[PDB]
């Protein structure tokens, strides 16, 4: 909408207060004009018609329970935009400052979030498996990273290319969580998953097997559920990424860690310069090796560590 840029205040899903960029024109809208061509947050009103209505508020104060998922979707989209701009010199998901749109309160009791090809969509959860999913910065960044992938490598959402697609979203969701530096970890979704159970998460990158996902290519899922295991076999790549960053010895193979920032550089370059819609895990290894070679040199520790990490998870 046309209006003037303002700054509202509210509380997110976890009860934390934060400032949000809004736009005033009769109402205060969840429209942040400070980033690219805008970040826009919509109310789906418990329905499944998208996007719903641009979120309007009479007073620029967002402290109602119903407001909390919108506050967090809007704020964490901003943090994710900032990560990609400041760390990778990428302007929004298309590289040309495309407007970022999100809808919250999608459906009833909806235990998921997704990128629908055009926008982010967040359920509120059923209150037992999940609380509103925009409360997780890693979840928001995971979703927005799907848009980045779709505009770049284009990894088809099935089988190995789809597991790479998933792992890229988990990797960058985690890197955004570290960038914001509030309770960061290598787990996925811990802030919104299972409010009655402490210490769990949807997936673990450091130990995928903790939540039943493979940590070695010999344990890959080969069936048809979950689009050929895209959220299952992602564990193999998530583990490789974790090892590249943090190091470790896994199935007897030792990996010298190089840190999160270099992990992010290598995988961002692989995603945007080398991967294609049909890339498989072996091709991802090659893309990551080449990316590290471009950035750090063929004799570098960084290249050696990428090779060790893929060796450790059985990907040649
Ligand atoms: C219990 C769940 C939260 C676990 C998992 N989801 C995630 O980890 C995050 N959402 P996501 O990975 O973005 C879904 N996304 C998904 O399933 O893609 C299908 C699609 C294709 C094209 C258009 C619209 C939707 C799942 O779906 O099994
Ligand atoms: Ca209000
Ligand atoms: Ca965390
Ligand atoms: Ca996390
Ligand atoms: Ca939990
Ligand atoms: Xe982005
Ligand atoms: Xe997620
Ligand atoms: Zn995903």
XYZ file of C-alpha atoms and ligand atoms in Angstrom:
351
model
C 0.000 0.000 0.000
C 1.088 3.604 -0.406
C 1.837 5.213 2.921
C 4.572 6.306 5.244
C 7.080 4.073 6.943
C 6.595 3.641 10.672
C 7.921 1.475 13.516
C 5.520 -0.603 15.595
C 6.185 -2.757 18.632
C 4.831 -6.128 19.602
C 5.463 -9.538 21.046
C 6.329 -12.687 19.165
C 5.234 -16.296 19.658
C 7.766 -16.880 22.469
C 6.705 -13.704 24.331
C 9.667 -11.554 23.354
C 9.195 -7.882 22.541
C 10.505 -6.563 19.247
C 10.153 -3.550 16.975
C 8.643 -4.109 13.516
C 8.683 -1.978 10.386
C 5.143 -0.987 9.397
C 3.396 1.348 6.955
C 0.744 3.874 7.950
C -2.208 4.748 5.760
C -5.377 4.899 7.913
C -4.243 1.612 9.503
C -0.773 0.437 10.360
C 0.091 -2.424 8.015
C 2.744 -5.133 8.305
C 4.617 -3.688 5.366
C 8.349 -3.074 5.837
C 9.600 -0.585 3.259
C 13.180 -0.607 4.542
C 14.159 -3.837 2.783
C 14.148 -4.178 -0.982
C 10.733 -3.788 -2.526
C 9.140 -4.565 0.796
C 8.261 -7.323 3.223
C 4.531 -7.884 3.492
C 2.720 -10.043 6.063
C -0.869 -11.238 5.615
C -3.656 -12.742 7.737
C -5.024 -16.002 6.293
C -7.718 -15.969 9.055
C -7.638 -19.758 9.587
C -8.558 -20.350 5.950
C -6.582 -21.747 3.047
C -7.179 -18.985 0.482
C -3.920 -17.122 -0.097
C -2.535 -14.678 0.645
C -5.415 -13.365 2.682
C -5.509 -9.735 3.741
C -2.486 -7.489 4.308
C -2.175 -7.345 8.084
C -3.805 -4.157 9.412
C -3.693 -2.853 12.965
C -5.340 0.251 14.402
C -2.592 1.423 16.800
C 0.814 0.056 15.693
C 1.010 -2.112 18.864
C 1.045 -5.875 18.276
C 0.703 -7.478 21.728
C -2.418 -9.592 21.186
C -2.067 -13.361 21.115
C -3.483 -13.349 17.570
C -0.728 -10.918 16.530
C 2.243 -13.000 17.689
C 2.697 -15.222 14.608
C 2.500 -12.208 12.337
C 5.071 -10.267 14.390
C 7.544 -13.133 14.073
C 6.933 -13.932 10.412
C 7.455 -10.278 9.559
C 10.496 -9.747 11.818
C 12.301 -12.981 10.933
C 11.748 -12.387 7.214
C 13.610 -9.113 7.808
C 16.471 -10.892 9.575
C 16.695 -13.410 6.753
C 16.755 -10.644 4.133
C 19.542 -8.969 6.102
C 21.559 -12.185 6.247
C 21.410 -12.745 2.511
C 22.169 -9.075 1.725
C 24.945 -8.512 4.259
C 26.625 -11.920 4.105
C 26.111 -12.961 0.458
C 25.366 -9.675 -1.327
C 22.026 -11.137 -2.457
C 19.034 -8.815 -2.697
C 15.947 -10.826 -1.693
C 15.216 -14.296 -2.984
C 15.413 -13.458 -6.702
C 18.544 -11.278 -6.381
C 16.545 -8.233 -7.576
C 14.762 -7.216 -4.383
C 11.494 -9.093 -4.998
C 8.834 -8.304 -2.431
C 8.684 -10.954 0.278
C 5.177 -12.061 1.193
C 4.106 -14.283 4.113
C 0.709 -15.442 5.388
C 0.077 -16.569 8.960
C -2.885 -18.256 10.606
C -3.084 -20.610 7.626
C -5.773 -23.243 8.066
C -6.694 -24.767 11.449
C -4.279 -26.707 13.637
C -1.837 -26.777 10.724
C 1.453 -28.429 11.698
C 3.613 -27.142 8.853
C 4.947 -24.180 6.908
C 5.864 -23.918 3.254
C 6.834 -21.844 0.236
C 3.996 -22.154 -2.281
C 6.004 -20.969 -5.316
C 5.153 -17.307 -4.597
C 5.029 -16.712 -0.847
C 5.657 -18.167 2.594
C 2.794 -19.784 4.510
C 2.730 -20.619 8.226
C 0.367 -22.805 10.233
C -0.406 -22.134 13.854
C 0.196 -25.724 14.868
C -2.236 -27.794 16.880
C -0.738 -26.642 20.154
C 0.714 -30.095 20.909
C 2.986 -30.964 17.985
C 3.715 -27.295 17.217
C 3.040 -23.744 18.312
C 2.831 -21.185 15.482
C 5.688 -22.059 13.188
C 6.864 -18.526 12.444
C 8.149 -18.470 16.012
C 11.236 -20.334 14.816
C 13.804 -18.164 13.071
C 15.328 -21.287 11.527
C 11.887 -22.271 10.174
C 11.299 -18.815 8.628
C 14.764 -18.808 7.076
C 14.262 -22.414 5.916
C 11.118 -21.358 4.058
C 12.624 -18.240 2.502
C 15.619 -20.312 1.438
C 13.290 -22.497 -0.619
C 12.535 -19.345 -2.653
C 16.281 -18.711 -3.069
C 16.795 -22.287 -4.256
C 13.867 -22.107 -6.661
C 15.315 -18.941 -8.247
C 18.872 -20.351 -8.459
C 19.719 -24.066 -8.656
C 16.061 -25.042 -9.053
C 16.538 -28.417 -7.326
C 13.549 -30.629 -8.168
C 11.647 -31.532 -4.968
C 12.067 -35.301 -5.016
C 14.705 -37.970 -4.363
C 18.331 -36.795 -4.082
C 17.880 -33.339 -5.626
C 14.984 -32.774 -3.248
C 17.027 -33.893 -0.227
C 19.693 -31.375 -1.297
C 16.953 -28.748 -1.594
C 15.866 -29.568 1.983
C 19.385 -29.590 3.359
C 20.123 -26.177 1.770
C 17.075 -24.803 3.605
C 18.220 -26.379 6.889
C 21.796 -25.154 6.426
C 20.814 -21.560 5.712
C 18.039 -21.632 8.267
C 20.700 -22.551 10.824
C 23.165 -19.962 9.534
C 20.458 -17.278 9.857
C 19.776 -18.474 13.404
C 23.480 -18.047 14.209
C 23.474 -14.621 12.496
C 20.714 -13.394 14.810
C 22.673 -14.993 17.677
C 19.764 -15.830 19.996
C 20.089 -19.368 21.370
C 21.674 -20.685 18.149
C 22.166 -24.397 17.561
C 22.384 -27.033 14.797
C 18.864 -28.281 15.471
C 15.801 -27.462 13.329
C 12.555 -26.140 14.776
C 13.331 -26.516 18.459
C 11.642 -23.210 19.333
C 8.206 -24.236 18.023
C 8.175 -28.046 18.191
C 6.392 -29.924 20.992
C 5.783 -27.277 23.661
C 5.287 -30.073 26.202
C 8.719 -31.683 25.612
C 11.960 -29.865 26.313
C 15.148 -30.516 24.442
C 13.797 -32.018 21.205
C 13.521 -30.718 17.667
C 12.225 -31.607 14.225
C 15.663 -32.595 12.886
C 19.252 -32.439 14.062
C 22.108 -31.513 11.737
C 24.776 -32.544 14.240
C 23.204 -35.971 14.868
C 20.424 -36.644 12.354
C 19.940 -40.141 13.670
C 18.610 -38.748 16.964
C 15.310 -38.115 15.123
C 15.582 -41.197 12.864
C 17.248 -39.623 9.855
C 20.279 -41.084 8.074
C 23.790 -39.809 8.676
C 25.489 -41.886 5.975
C 24.632 -42.630 2.357
C 24.461 -46.375 3.127
C 21.409 -45.600 5.294
C 19.552 -43.547 2.713
C 15.818 -43.993 2.294
C 14.862 -45.365 -1.095
C 11.055 -45.521 -0.848
C 8.349 -43.153 -2.014
C 7.107 -41.457 1.167
C 7.965 -37.793 1.661
C 8.708 -37.217 -2.054
C 11.355 -39.923 -1.924
C 12.618 -38.968 1.518
C 13.451 -35.284 1.012
C 13.198 -34.502 4.772
C 14.875 -37.827 5.654
C 17.870 -38.050 3.298
C 18.573 -34.371 3.950
C 20.238 -35.729 7.104
C 23.149 -37.049 5.059
C 23.900 -33.596 3.631
C 23.091 -31.800 6.891
C 25.644 -33.984 8.629
C 28.253 -33.235 5.953
C 27.619 -29.481 6.365
C 27.850 -29.736 10.141
C 31.161 -31.591 9.816
C 32.559 -29.015 7.363
C 31.792 -26.243 9.831
C 32.432 -27.843 13.205
C 34.665 -30.822 12.470
C 34.511 -34.263 13.988
C 35.213 -37.925 13.416
C 32.230 -39.765 11.956
C 32.272 -43.457 11.029
C 36.019 -43.273 11.609
C 36.621 -40.401 9.149
C 38.092 -37.232 10.670
C 37.064 -33.797 9.411
C 38.857 -30.574 10.254
C 36.227 -27.880 10.797
C 36.503 -24.563 8.953
C 33.685 -22.664 10.641
C 30.182 -21.468 9.793
C 31.146 -18.496 7.671
C 33.226 -20.561 5.242
C 30.521 -23.266 5.196
C 28.035 -20.582 4.175
C 30.318 -19.190 1.479
C 30.985 -22.604 -0.013
C 27.363 -23.730 -0.049
C 26.055 -20.357 -1.269
C 28.468 -20.528 -4.195
C 27.561 -24.142 -4.885
C 23.847 -23.296 -4.852
C 24.119 -20.265 -7.108
C 26.897 -21.279 -9.521
C 27.090 -25.066 -9.802
C 23.975 -26.976 -8.750
C 21.215 -27.703 -11.265
C 17.643 -28.942 -10.986
C 18.680 -32.586 -11.183
C 21.857 -32.566 -9.103
C 22.413 -35.686 -7.023
C 24.560 -36.082 -3.909
C 27.717 -36.956 -5.846
C 27.197 -33.826 -7.947
C 26.725 -31.765 -4.793
C 30.089 -33.024 -3.525
C 31.676 -31.944 -6.804
C 29.945 -28.551 -6.658
C 31.104 -27.977 -3.089
C 34.678 -29.023 -3.918
C 34.742 -26.665 -6.900
C 33.209 -23.822 -4.870
C 35.802 -24.224 -2.137
C 38.533 -24.375 -4.811
C 37.289 -21.096 -6.356
C 37.193 -19.391 -2.959
C 40.238 -20.787 -1.166
C 42.467 -22.597 -3.660
C 42.840 -26.220 -4.697
C 45.481 -26.943 -2.011
C 43.527 -25.282 0.764
C 42.363 -26.773 4.035
C 38.818 -25.768 3.040
C 38.880 -28.053 -0.014
C 40.421 -30.895 2.009
C 37.698 -30.524 4.671
C 34.853 -30.580 2.125
C 36.267 -33.854 0.784
C 36.651 -35.365 4.271
C 33.073 -34.429 5.214
C 31.544 -36.021 2.131
C 33.793 -39.064 2.660
C 32.523 -39.338 6.225
C 28.891 -39.513 5.059
C 29.680 -41.961 2.278
C 29.215 -39.600 -0.671
C 31.823 -39.901 -3.403
C 6.409 -31.882 10.440
C 6.835 -30.993 9.265
C 6.878 -29.515 9.708
C 8.174 -31.502 8.770
C 8.443 -31.171 7.301
N 8.422 -29.769 6.995
C 9.530 -28.972 7.218
O 10.552 -29.418 7.692
C 9.409 -27.521 6.844
N 8.413 -27.254 5.814
P 8.764 -27.390 4.179
O 10.031 -28.256 4.048
O 8.918 -26.057 3.486
C 7.292 -28.244 3.562
N 7.128 -28.061 2.137
C 6.624 -29.081 1.275
O 6.214 -30.137 1.707
O 6.644 -28.812 -0.116
C 5.486 -29.229 -0.865
C 5.077 -28.054 -1.813
C 5.535 -27.999 -3.127
C 5.143 -26.955 -3.976
C 4.267 -25.960 -3.547
C 3.787 -26.045 -2.245
C 4.187 -27.059 -1.388
C 7.525 -31.883 6.343
O 6.812 -31.241 5.507
O 7.518 -33.156 6.356
Ca -2.873 -3.235 17.919
Ca 17.903 -22.247 18.748
Ca 17.650 -24.187 15.470
Ca 9.769 -29.343 22.254
Xe 16.098 -13.706 0.986
Xe 11.770 -26.183 9.191
Zn 11.715 -27.460 3.421
